[PDB]
Every structure is written in structure tokens, then in C-alpha cells.
Amino acid sequence: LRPAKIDRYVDKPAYTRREYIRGAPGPKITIFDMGNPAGDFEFEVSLHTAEPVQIRQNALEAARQQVNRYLQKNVGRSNYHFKIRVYPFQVLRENPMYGNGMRRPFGKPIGLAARLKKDQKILSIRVNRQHLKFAIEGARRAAMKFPCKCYYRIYDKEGNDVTTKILSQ
Amino acid sequence: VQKAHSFRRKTRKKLSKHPRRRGLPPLTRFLQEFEVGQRVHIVIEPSYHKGMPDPRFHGRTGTVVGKRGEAYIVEIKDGSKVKTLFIHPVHLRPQK
RNA sequence: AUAGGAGGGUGCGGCCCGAAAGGAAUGAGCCUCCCCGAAGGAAACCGCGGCGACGCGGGAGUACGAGGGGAGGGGACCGG
RNA sequence: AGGGAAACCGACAUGCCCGCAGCCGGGCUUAUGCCCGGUGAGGGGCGGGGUGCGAAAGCGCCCGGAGUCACGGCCGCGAG
RNA sequence: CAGUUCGCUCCCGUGACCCCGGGCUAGGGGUGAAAGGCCAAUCGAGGCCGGAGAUAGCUGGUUCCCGCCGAAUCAUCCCGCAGGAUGGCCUCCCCGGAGGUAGGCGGUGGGGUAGAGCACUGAUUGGAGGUGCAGGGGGCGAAAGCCCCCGGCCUCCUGUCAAACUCCGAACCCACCGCCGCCGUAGAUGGGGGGAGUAGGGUGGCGGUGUAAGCCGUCCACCGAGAGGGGAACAACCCAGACCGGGGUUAAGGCCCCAAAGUGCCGGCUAAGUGUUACUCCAAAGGGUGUCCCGGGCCUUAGACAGGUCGAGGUCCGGGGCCCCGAAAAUGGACGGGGCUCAAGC
RNA sequence: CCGACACAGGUGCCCCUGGGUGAGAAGCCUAAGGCGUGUCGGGGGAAACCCGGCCGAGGGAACUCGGCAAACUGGCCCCG
RNA sequence: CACAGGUCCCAGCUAGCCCGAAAGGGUUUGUACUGGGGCCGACGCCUGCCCAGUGCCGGUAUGUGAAGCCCGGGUACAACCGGGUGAAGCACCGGUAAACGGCGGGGGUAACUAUAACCCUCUUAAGGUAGCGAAAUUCCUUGUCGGUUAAAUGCCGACCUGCAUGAAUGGCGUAACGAGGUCCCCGCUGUCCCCGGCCGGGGCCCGGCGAAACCUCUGCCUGGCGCGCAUGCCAGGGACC
RNA sequence: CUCAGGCGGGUCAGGAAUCCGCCGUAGAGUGCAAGGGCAAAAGCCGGCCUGACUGGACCCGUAACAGAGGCGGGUCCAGCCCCGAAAGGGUGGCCUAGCGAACCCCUGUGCCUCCCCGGUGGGGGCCAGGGAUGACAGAAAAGCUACCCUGGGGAUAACAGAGUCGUCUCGGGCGAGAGCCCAUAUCGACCCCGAGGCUUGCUACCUCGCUGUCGGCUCUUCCCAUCCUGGCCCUGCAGCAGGGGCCAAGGGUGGGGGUGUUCACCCAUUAAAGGGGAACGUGAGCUGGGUUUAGACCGUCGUGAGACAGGUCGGAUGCUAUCUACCGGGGGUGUUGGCCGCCUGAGGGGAAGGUGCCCCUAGUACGAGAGGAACAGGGUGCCGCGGCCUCUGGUCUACCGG
RNA sequence: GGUACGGCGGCCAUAGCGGGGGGGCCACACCCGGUCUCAUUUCGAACCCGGAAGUUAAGCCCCCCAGCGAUCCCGGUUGUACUGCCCUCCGAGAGGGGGCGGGAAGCCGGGGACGCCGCCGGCCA
């Protein structure tokens, strides 16, 4: 597996038309909703990206697995809702290189990634007051697996930012 | 790979029509008249396939300098060359 | 014989040459004085503003200014 | 005197319109000069004409006289 | 010593042996126990002279001065790709006579890019409702059938997309008309003729491609084909476009010394020689009661914390500036150098 | 004589060789014959280093691609 | 490379093979125990299958097959068109492998587990026999086992899984021979541990004769810029001739 | 006249035979790819017909601006016609692909013409259609070169240099999990951020009027990401030893077997037997074993000449130092007159030293036991360096003897 | 001049889809019957020929709505997203920023919108 810095940046154009892309791989991440989606939770911790970034499906799956394990261990399946709000659409290609070099260098698909915009939410963990610390820790652990700087905010049901208010008292 | 220019080369959107404008256009544009020296814009009607100028000259403004049959003779200046075209009135619009 | 750059360019200073063809005793370098001067352009001092570096008005568009002219002294160099 | 593969046929010495320079007349302008109205060589455009294709229309080329010789120069082709 | 030699060592030395004189085989030919070997220091076709000054798109060279204007390496075609022709861009001469449009304002038309969005086409997490739907599998029943789920297909909610999607849609670009501006009767726009050179471009911004360097186009700004003043030197970066002799003021930028100009002024920050870098060169994720600040909070001046007693402010959170760790290379040494700490850094 | 030469090559080793040792026209010494012209001389603990030659304690191929080079044996008689 | 030996092919003479423009000629003052043309290469034991492919040889009934000749048309004569005859050569048939060259694959295989060995059948002519094998041939490879050494990408013997051995482009073996390549043992030694002395000739100085290769000008460094590795440029360091 | 699909209802008949009603902007269809256009149609079903024609103009595109043989398309005039009541439409396919110079030849159709005239056979010419060049703006066309030759190219490869670091080597963030519990004694998944230019690759920027390759020997020097030697921290550190980490580059890091080998493997010692840079340091220093000419053999491929980043045997290494560089040896000038002698020490160089073992401490501390230290104190070896010839050995072309 | 009358058109959804109430002087229709004109790939269903017994049930005409669709104005998101020219402005990079000039899309809230308009004629006056 090549370094993620090769695909971290969004200079290249969007490459997501499976009708014309030949051999595009299938997704490696298949679960995006976990916990109790229909539960009534007071607070929502959302993780935002600081820069326009491409997050590989491998990183998304790793963050999903670790955060879900931590939440199951420390919260309870019926006390949280962990959701990943972005699906990988961009197709990551690579130069398929006795042995020519840079001749016909158009790349073949090798993976998938999700492209995001500045200050865009990546994932959201809905929890009650008690489990806010665990939600924050899970968000931090997820952020530690991404190729860019990320921050987290706490919103109430309406959508007002109350992160400082809550974390202070 | 180099591609030569043809009549419909790269005209997916230029020669397309608004979805609500599908069908025959009103007959005023078809039956309009012009006078020598009048200046007219070249706006192609994709539905009518007769008397259509090359799409490369779509959107320009030319000078009427005569008439042949039901087509108007329109002169344009491409760079420094004078080009004469025979355009059906349905593909024309008066200036102002 | 304590000094660094393709061996030259700009400016001048030592040492040396300097009859002719270049100026010059019908005056050379040089010393003094007087007049007009384009663009530009101070300060002493007086009053005021600013926390301060400093600035504003007068002095003043004055002294000076590339160059263009004139007079006086000396008597052999200047250019090269 | 051109048109045509060939047989072969075979044309404006100005019918008309715009119009620069020049010329004429008028106004302003010290003058230069500018403006206006006519005539306008050369110039442009119509009209008409010869021939080739055609049943004809219509088109191509051409038609209201400038060429020729010489000295020198640039260039293209072939010869080293 | 020698355009093949000398020394030691080594092999044959009555045989297919070594040597001499007279003869024959001559160049696509001779001779060859076959190595393309030898044929007068020449052999995958000898030498001499003639064709012959052969030809080449390939390499090199092309001789006096000043004056005026001044390019190009991009489109089509070639057994074309180190070469040519037709165009484009340069220059010189002449005809024509009243206009022209690089810039701008307003108007009449064209557009589908950036952005955005799901109204089409194709993708996309979960939930709710509706449909027996060739789904399919089970309970149920000799059998025909029902009852369960799961799946398929529609509507809605929820969470996301598109270079080969668009219900929308700029900046902006182009054509034409009126005008301002500029050029033009000291003759433009335009037309005819003569002579070219140019068919490897580079840097820089943008677009496609690539791990990146790079490759391929586009923009015409700079070098090519460009002096002078600076960035330490530097093609391309900044000022600037230059006839000759003088005077002055400014531009880029600079003022502690090298080095002309301040150890200049006020407020704040840095303790790391961090820095002393406009760009050509410049290290990150992650962390820091290191400091200087801003904004929100909860307790809150004999009451808050540190250890029911003292008795002045505490305890968090999200941020901003500078700095710190993360940070290992080969000749001795690089902020240009010296050096610089209320600065000569920011 | 040929090779550009007063060339260590080739042509001509083409014809011949006293005494001793010895199988020998071998090696060494020597008589006759020839020469000091295989042509620049002189100096010197006057070095390092290079080329030719001799020896070298203990070990004996540990060197090296490889015992390259050198060393060991060496003639004659008898046995085997 | 040659060689003696083996074997194959053409030729009864005005032949076979060959030089040449021709005339004439070489083999030839020759005559099958001969002349000419290939391949292997003393000697010992042997040399298996295949004639579909290419080549060579013989036949060629039959098809095609040039000119010439004949017939009809055409031309006042020809040019021209159609048909008949039709050699060689090809098509066609057969021989020929010490001619060029080839000698696989599956269906399978069972009985003991592998093994599969005998063994039967089809694609096209046949499916590699005797021998030899990790080889001057073996990719994996420094194959595996044994010997040689303390230690073995070496050498020798064996195994067979022969990428890609093999019978006259010969297979296998072989005494004697070799300035051929290759491994080991005794002995020897300055090859080496580890180099040290000595001899003669140069080197060095002095007296003479006396050149050439080469040469943009010049000529100190560290870190940089640059066509990317500078004595000459930039900032520094050092340096008497 | 109106499609695809869907809904409700119908004998065989069900998912799908053939029907009936409703919804249905095209979700159908077009001769064919895609794009666009087409719903009282350009689609579906029917009637008639051949304009898929003849003689000609002007214009757009291929080929913007900006030149073009050939080709395609558009707007028209005339002729003779098709459909329709008429308007109106028809010069092929709804628009964009389905194709091609010169010369020569075949065909149609009318005319001109063939050397003094005329006739006949035959020939030539003008116009239209056709036979093809796919390398498609149009030569008719198989290979080896290692015996090669020539002219050039750093416009263009192999080694090296330069840029980059995908790969390579080496670090860091988080912490699921393994560790009796315990994430961090030790290992650390899935993910993410970096350093070096020590492997390989990519690019083609310098070098093809010449910069000699791998390996070994000789010799010099440098980096730390340290193998040992010096000093420390954590430990799942009792001692003896281990695992992880920090400071530290003064010194050492050796000898052998096969192989051309670097490397890797193996043997006996050792404290250790570290990885790298210097034009993959070092051929005007050496050697020439591997690699890469010319000779030859084997296997495989090719009809063949031949080829093989497949083996195998053989196969040349030029130098009189011009400048600078370093090693030592000399002659001058200057240092305010000259000369002899003795000193000072600014500076530069050094490793002048490095490292084992043995005896005691001690069979002690520690430990159930086995096993087993350290401080201090003594001895000595090896490597390196600088000197000497009394002793021992070599030589001793002085010398003596056989 | 009137008319809850018709024919031929213009812009071609702000005009459409879906709903509610009202009308029959003339006029427009539904509708009665198929000999003649015309037709069914059967059907007088359509098309066509001949008329008025009935009806305004609905096409048509007059008025009304805001459920869907469309679209105009205003306010908020917002001078946000994005962008032309210059830059010795910042950022390790990605990229951003300053000056002058342009400026959305979508969403939310309040209004608009159930079409305007032209020529002629019929009937009445």
C-alpha cells in the first residue's frame, strides 16, 4: 500500500463515473450507521476537517472500527449513534509500472477515497450528557487516523454550537 | 489524437434545445423578412435542418446583402476574410 | 621578493619623455576680482505643532548652481 | 485579338454612374489653409460584345491601343 | 635496436622436414591442411591512373565601417520527423483616396466553464409506509394452498456524489451598432510587386497526465535577440528598456562595519543565535501551566482553590502571536561575511 | 646489401673448424686468426627508486582466479 | 583444421565434373583396384523408427501449358478475335533418410499409499531403441546423496526431474600421445607471515653532442551559483620569492 | 393513428398467448456507435411513385484566423417528372462516418481529327460512369553482420553525475490486542506524518572531433542511524547474563574454504570480528579472474546467412611531468647598519597510546540450589608508535680455507 | 354601443395539472338516422352525409383557489460561494490574503400568479 500523501490532495479532477471507468474496485467499507440510529440523544459531537482533503477508504474503515470498538466497550449499543457522513466516490489510480516507463502512463484503478471540502463534517456521534467524554475521545481517535488537521464541535438538537459551554462546567 | 472539424463536432450543448422548447418554434421567426443592409444575429434552430449555417458561425452578427430563393445572403468578417453564407430566416434574428 | 584574478574599462596621482607635425610670449598651467545664469537648491536666527525621530511659516527661491562673458597679476607650460 | 482539345468562330477607337489630383466659381481665413458647387485625365463600377459548355438562362477567359530593345541590380532552376 | 625487436623459459629436430636458383597461377580473380587466412608494411574483394571538382537532407568555414526598421521555432501536406513546399510573423518599392479600431462607456445577440443542485442518466447509509412481485427460503398443510421472514420494486424522511449528469448559473470572452479616446490627406484600413529568415525554443501563470521530477498544450509577459541599477553570485525575479558631453532629482531597494545613507522614533513580542530569506533554496503529523493576549464559561475578595481551619481570586474550555520538542552524513564553512539580544531579530 | 640510418631485424649458417674435460659440431678454459668500433667519457658507501643476479632464520601455499615466478630432481653404473 | 580408415553419389570415353565470348581446353601420356563430387573421421562394440514436409530420381495415363503450324471469322491485303495440335515444366503416382531434417500429446492406467513397470486407444508419418545424463548440453541450481577439507558456488562417484542428450551434423568406450582446459597428494621453495642484506647496470653530479610528444592565456583552497563535478565567478581562508 | 412501462377486469390462458378501460412528455422507436432533433411526427400502419435524374451557377467545411489538388455539404436557374384538393415538398437515407491523384484500361454518348487530295479497316481527341493505391495528399519490395566501413548525434540508450523518492534504509503519532491483573518491561495489528540519498527505478538536464568497466591488492581521509572499548536510564533487572533506550566517533573491528565475485554461507579464534561517503575514492599505482570485439565447441530457435541479459576454452593494459599538489633538501630579500652565540614560544602536528587475560577481593555479595559478581591492589600478553646492535639470526662480490 | 356568442391568430405554463359555483335569444355542443357522398384492414367507434324530440349532464363560456408544477418581486443566509487585473502580503507545502471591479445557485419567510392581447363576424340595440 502506497503512502496516503500521494492521494491526500485534491488537485486532480473528479474521477467517479463507473459507467466509463473500467475495473473500478468495489468498496472496502460497508457499514456507515451504528448504535441506535433512532435513539433520542441530547448532544451530537461532529468532527470537521480543517482543509479540503481526500480520505482513503482504508483510513475510513480503520477509524470506523476503532471508534465503534471504543464506543461499544465504554458506552453501550443502546446509548450512542456513530455515523460516517461521507461515502468514497473518487477512484484512486496508479501507473501500471523489460518494463516500460511513463509510456502510456494512464493509471489503473487501485482504490477508493472520499473527497471533502473545507470545514466539512466527516462523522457524527450522537450521545447523551453522560457519554460526552467518551464521544470526544472517540472523535479524537478517529481524527488521529486521518491525513489532515481536524477539530470537533458539540451541537444540541437544534444545531447551535455549545462546545465551550458544555466542556467548561 | 487530433480530430478534424465536422458539422456536428462539439455541439452537444450549443445545438441542444431547452426541454420546454421541444417541438416546432413559433412561425414568426420562420416567416420574418429582412432588408438589404439590415444586421441580423445568427441563432440556429436545431429542429430545422435545412439552410443551416456551419455551427462555427453561431451567435455572430452579419449583414444582409441579398436574397436567393427563401434563403438570405449574410456576410460576416472572420478575422480579415469576408465570408458569404446562405441562411434560412428561421436561423436569423433582427438586431434591436 | 606580504599579495589574487581572462591580464582589460572609468578617474586621477607618482617616475620618465616631450624640436617637427597640436595650442602657446599676438600669452600656458596658474592666482585675484566682476556680471548673467537653465533644472535644482541650503543654513545661522525668529515663532508654532509633535511623546519623539522631526516638521510647518519667514529668512528665500537667497548663498550656491552646468555654462556663457569681462578685467587685473605672472611669465612657459598645456595637450599628448 | 482573344476563346477552344480540335474543326472552327471572332470583340466597346466610350452607352452610362461614382470619383482622387488638377482646373473653374463662391464663402471664411492676414496669408497659408478650410468648406461648398461644377468639370474631372488616371482609378473603380455598371451596361453591352467575342469565344468554350449548353436547348436556353447562366458562367470561365478576353475586349474602349502600350509594347519592345538596351545597361545595371535582386531572385528561381540546371550545370562542380 | 626494431611501423613485431630482445632475454629467460618452452616445442620439433630423417621427415607431411628446412633452405636456395630457374618457372607458372592476377583481382569477383588467384591460392588456401579452411583462420575470411595470404596475394610487396594494404585484403569481407589488392595497387596505379582515369570517370571525378561523384554525391550527402550530415560536420566545419565564409574577410571593411556606420545609419534605418526588425522576426520565428506554429497550422496543412510530403517513405515526412536532423530535410522541404504552401501559409502565418519581418523588411523594401509602388498604386488608392476617407477611413480605421488595440483601450473604454451604453445597447442588441451567443455561450454552459467555476460555483451550486438532484428536476433527467448513472452512483449512495439507515429508517418508515405500500406492493405477491417468475423474487427466494422456512412454518403450515397430501397438497391445492395459506402464515412468517428475507429479497425486488415505488413514495417519503435521513446522510452523501459525477470529465464523459444538469431544473439553475456567474466572473468572463466573442460578433455587431452609437459615442469618447487614439491613428490618418506629411496618406491609415486596404491592394500589387521584390527579398527573406523561421519548422529543436526556454522561464513564468493556467489546464490534462505522472509518486514526483518530467511530458503534452495553452497565456505573449521576460531570455532567445536586451544595456544599466539590485536580489552574494543567478537567463527567467524587482526597477528599467539605451545616440554623445555635462548638472540635478528619483525608481528597485537600502541606512551597525564590510558599503553611500540612522547604532533613527514610538507601542508590543522573542531567549530560540529562532531569526538576521519578497521569489529563484527553505521540513511534516503529533505535542508544550514556555511566554504575551482575545472570547466564552462555573465557583467567585473574611465565601472561591493549595495544605475545616486560614482569607484573595480561582477552576475549565475554544482560539490568536512568537518560541520550544519532534530534527541523523559523509574534505573544514556558511544569515554573502563580521557579528547582532529594550536588537544589527519579528 | 634490404629495411629512410654506421638499424640488436632479414638476406648468408652459403661452404670449413687445433688442444683439454667430456658421448658430443654441448657448456667451460685455451692455441691460430681477429678485436678493444656490438664506440661518448669522468666522479661516487653519492641516497630513494627501477631493471638483471646471489643468499636468507622458524613455518611451508596460510599468497593468488589459478603454485604465475622461483625452488626441488638432474649425468653414468647396479638393483628394482 | 588436416590425416589414415568408414560410407554415399555421378560417369563405359564424343562419358561424369569444370574454364570460356568463341575457338578450343583441365581431369588426360588417364579408363571403374579409375576420374570427379559430399559427410563422418585411428582402434573396439554398435548405428533403432519415420518418405506426410523440403530436396533428388524414375513414370507421366490425365489436366494445364509458349512460339510455330492448321481451321473459321475479320481485313479489297494485314493488324485483330475464337478454336485444334501442343514439348519442357508444374499438377499426379512411386522409390529414396551414412538426402535436409523429426522421433510429442493426451484417455488412462489399477493393484500396495506414493510407484505405475509391463499393458490397450486416438489426433499427424513416428513417437527417442542400444547407449550416455546437473554434462564444454541443466533454467530453477551452490539440484540431492557419498568421498575429499576444520570449514567445499570446486573436484570425483551415483540418482534421474533430460527447461533444451542420442546413434555417420554419429552414440558409447578407449591404450599411447598433448607448451589443450581441470581437481588432488608427496617434495620444494621469499608466493606469503615480513620482509632484510649484497653484486653489476641506470638513477645523481661534472665535461661534450643534442632533440621530440605536447602547448588559447594562465594556474592555492572551503561552501555555493552555473550546461547540474570551477585554479580564473560570489562570500570567506591562506599564501615572501 | 400514437409509443415504453404500470394499474384494475377477463374460457382454456399461468410471469409471459389474445382482448377491454384508465394513467402515461416519450421513461418507446429511428437500419446500425454516440451526440442532437423528432408525438394531430421525422415514429407505426397504408395509397401512388422513382428527384438515388439531365444541362449548369454561387457559397460553407476538410484546411477558424490564413494558402489547396480531391472529397463532402448548402442556396438556386432551366428541362422532363413523382405525390397532393391546394399550399407546399422531392438533386437519396432526420444532421454529423461507410472511402481515394497522375498514367493506362473498360463502358455510354454524340462530335473533332490522323502529315498532297478522296474512300475503307484501324488509331488519336472532348464529355460522363467504372477498375486503387488502408503507409488511406496515392514507390511494385525479405533478413544477418560479433569481419563490418563512413558522416553525425549527448536532438537519443548502457556506467557515472544531476532532479525525484514510487521502491530501499531509518525514525515518529494513535493504541485494538498479546503479556497471570497491567497498552506502553517487550511486541504492537488497522490507519496516518516524516528523515537520508547508503538498493532499485523513473526523467533525459552535462558529457559520444573519445572522462578506459566489475572484483582484488596498495594508500589516504570523513559521517553516526555505535559492533566492541568509556559513562548512564527503564526492565516481566536475585547473581552470572539478557531485552529496550540515552551521551559518546579517541582507538579496534582480524585469519581462512569453495566462488571472478561485492554479497551471502561455513570453520577456528576474538571484547567486537558495525553499516556507509569520497566520480558505485583510488588502472598518467598495480593485477586482469568476471564483463563486452575478432578464433572455436555444446544446447535451443531459424529453410538460411545467423542469434541467444545460456554455458564453455583462448584472447594487448602506451608516458621524457608543462602548472599546481604533497614529501624532504638548498639560494636570496625583508624584518630601519653588519656579524657570532644562546634562548623565548604566537601558532601548527600527535593515539602516542589502545585493548585483553591472569592472581587476590572470593567460592565472598546474590541465590533454595546450581551457579556466581564488583570497588581497590598486583602481574603480564597482543596491536601501534619512536629508538639501538651489547646478545641471537640473515647478509657481509672486505677477508681466510677446501 | 352591448353580448356567461363564434372564426382566424400573437406571446407559448405567471398561461399547465387538479378542484368549486353559475348558462343556454342567437351561437357552440351532446344527440336522432345512415338511401345518397365518404369508411372501417369488423364496428356510422372515428371520418363522412341527413336534422332537430331532448339536454345543458360536459366540451364551451362567466367567476373563484395556491394542493402539485411554473415563475416574478422583496427580506435573511450574503456581498456568502466564485471570479477579471496588480502585488517585494502570508503560508513548509496545499493554498490563501490585500487594493479596485463583478457576483451567484440552493434553502427559509412574506407577497404575485388558476393567463394578457389583436382582426373580423353572428345576435340584439
UniProtKB/Swiss-Prot annotation, chain A:
- Keywords for this protein: Ribonucleoprotein, Ribosomal protein
Classification via SUPFAM superfamilies: Ribosomal protein L16p/L10e
Q: Which domain of life is it from?
A: Archaea
UniProt GO cellular component terms: ribonucleoprotein complex; ribosome
Give the similarity note. Answer: Belongs to the universal ribosomal protein uL16 family.
Q: Could you describe the subunit structure of this protein?
A: Part of the 50S ribosomal subunit.
NCBIfam families hit by this protein: PRK04199.1-2, PRK04199.1-4
Give the protein's recorded name. Answer: Large ribosomal subunit protein uL16
Swiss-Prot record, chain B:
Keyword field contains Cytoplasm: no
Listed Basic residues bias regions: 1-23
Please indicate if the UniProt record lists Iron as a keyword: no
**One Pfam family this chain carries?**
Ribosomal_L21e
Question: Which intervals of the chain are annotated as region Disordered?
Answer: 1-24
User: What UniProt keywords apply to this chain's record, in alphabetical order?
Assistant: Ribonucleoprotein, Ribosomal protein
Please give the InterPro entries that the UniProt record associates with this protein.
Answer: Ribosomal_eL21 (IPR001147), Ribosomal_eL21_arc (IPR022856), Ribosomal_eL21_CS (IPR018259), Ribosomal_eL21_sf (IPR036948), Translation_prot_SH3-like_sf (IPR008991)
GO terms (BP aspect)? translation
Q: Which domain of life is it from?
A: Archaea
Tell me the GO molecular function terms. structural constituent of ribosome
Q: Name one GO cellular component term.
A: ribonucleoprotein complex
Give the transmembrane region(s): none
Subunit relationships: Part of the 50S ribosomal subunit.
Belongs to which family?
Answer: Belongs to the eukaryotic ribosomal protein eL21 family.
Protein name as annotated: Large ribosomal subunit protein eL21
Name the species this protein comes from: Pyrococcus furiosus (strain ATCC 43587 / DSM 3638 / JCM 8422 / Vc1)
Tell me the lineage of the source organism: Archaea, Methanobacteriati, Methanobacteriota, Thermococci, Thermococcales
